Structures are given as structure tokens and as C-alpha cells.
Amino acid sequence: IGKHVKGYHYIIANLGFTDGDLLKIQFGGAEVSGFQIVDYDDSLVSKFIE
Amino acid sequence: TAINVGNINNDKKDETYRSLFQDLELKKERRVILDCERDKVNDIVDQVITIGKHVKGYHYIIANLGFTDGDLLKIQFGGAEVSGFQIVDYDDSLVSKFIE
Numbered sequence A: 001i002g003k004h005v006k007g008y009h010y011i012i013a014n015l016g017f018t019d020g021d022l023l024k025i026q027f028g029g030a031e032v033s034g035f036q037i038v039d040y041d042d043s044l045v046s047k048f049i050e
Numbered sequence B: 001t002a003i004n005v006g007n008i009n010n011d012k013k014d015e016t017y018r019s020l021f022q023d024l025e026l027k028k029e030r031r032v033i034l035d036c037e038r039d040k041v042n043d044i045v046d047q048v049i050t051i052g053k054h055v056k057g058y059h060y061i062i063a064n065l066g067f068t069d070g071d072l073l074k075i076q077f078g079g080a081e082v083s084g085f086q087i088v089d090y091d092d093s094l095v096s097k098f099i100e
Helices: A043-049 B013-021 B038-051 B093-099
Strands: A009-011 A031-033 B031-033 B059-061 B081-083
Touching: B013 B038
Parallel strands: A009 A031, B031 B059, B059 B081
Antiparallel strands: none
């Protein structure tokens, strides 16, 4: 429908922000916020991901 | 406002396309002609959706003899009007016998 351009603002209320496929509304223009509990920045996680 | 869209590679495709429409944003362009082969139509149209240039306001013209031959349902409900050309008429009774 096209409601994701500059103007809209969405919140994903779950602990898996990077889990969902987000690139689809990455370039749309709207801002998107969310939450993450599995931080891919902590060094222990990188050892697990590898 | 004629832009040569032909000479582009496949690994720097998403970068040049957004830069093209941010060049078509200088004029505040709402009316575009595409004039491309059907394979390149959907690659443009796909990027058109991801940057968000298909809402109420825009209007495009697909300059090729196959308007229904490519996928159109994706930009169907965005709001923008889309024009094009069709030579293979699917209402003729000679084609319907060929299609069945």
C-alpha cells in the first residue's frame, strides 16, 4: 500500500529486532525502532555465531 | 530529463538507482518514462517500491509493447498510476483460442 515513506514511524515490540527481515523497509524513508536482547556486538556472541 | 539507465553493473545496482532518483528529486519529478526491456522494467520497478516512489502522486509510462507481459501486481495498490502499451490483445477471440 506504500505506508513506509518519510513520515511514518514504527515500533517492533519484541526482543528480536535483527531477527526479522528488515531490509525490505530499510530504504523506504520511514523510521523504525525496536528492541534487541541478543547483541551481536558482544564478543562472546561472535564466538558463538562463527 | 533523459538519463542513460543502460550502462550499469549488477553489484553496484542498488547504489546507483537510489542516486538516480535523488537526482530525479532535484526537479521534484513525478512523471517518468522508462523505455526498457521487460527484464529491466521489474528491476527498476522493484527499486521504485523499496525507496517509496509509487504512492499517490507519481505516474509512470512503460514504453514497451508488453505491458501485461511483466509483473504488475506489486505496484498495483501503491497509489501511483501506471501507463503502458500492449500489442497482444487478450480479448480477441483468436488469441483466446490460442491461449486455451
